[PDB]
């Protein structure tokens, strides 16, 4: 997102409920998971590239 708002979410905000999670790779505010710290887009490149372990495509 905007570079001023990437640094704001990383610091210590007033009124601790006010904190939120962004994507660690790009800074997207929405659809960011907590196991990986990545958004749904950045999860999709790195799981295909093999850059984060355990994860592959699934079929059952």
């Amino acid at each position: 997102a905007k570079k001023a708002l990437v640094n704001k979410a990383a610091g210590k905000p007033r009124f601790a409920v006010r904190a939120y999670t962004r994507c660690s790779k790009c800074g997207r505010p929405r659809a960011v998971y907590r196991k990986f710290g990545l958004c749904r887009i950045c999860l999709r490149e790195m799981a295909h590239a093999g850059e984060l372990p355990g994860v592959q495509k699934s079929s059952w």
């Binding site: 999709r44 799981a47 355990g54 994860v55 592959q56 699934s58």
Partner: protein, 99 residues
């Protein structure tokens, strides 16, 4: 008795059984006794994301994450194999516990 309980967890097959059947085989040469690798059930995390970066809700990828879990539970306690469980060349993908 039930003094040494080890709890190998890994992400992939042919790395959790090779690291137990032949690598934690290095203690039974000292005259101890294992009850074999005991396979536990497997966790399966599930994720489901949108392929497009915009507007296409109906196209999706499914990503999983399997965590294989085994258990060995060697019985006989000896003081000279306390250090022989320390200096073992484990691979990177496997985590060991001492219960």
């Amino acid at each position: 008795g039930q003094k040494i309980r080890i709890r190998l967890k890994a992400y992939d097959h042919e790395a959790i059984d090779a690291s137990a059947r032949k690598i934690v085989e290095t203690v039974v040469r000292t005259g101890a006794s294992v009850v074999g690798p005991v396979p536990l059930p497997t966790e399966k995390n599930v994720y489901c994301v949108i392929r497009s970066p915009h507007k296409y809700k109906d196209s999706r990828e499914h990503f999983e994450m399997r965590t294989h879990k085994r258990l060995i539970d060697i019985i006989d306690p000896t003081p000279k194999t306390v250090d022989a469980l320390m200096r073992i060349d484990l691979p990177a993908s496997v985590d060991v516990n001492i219960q």
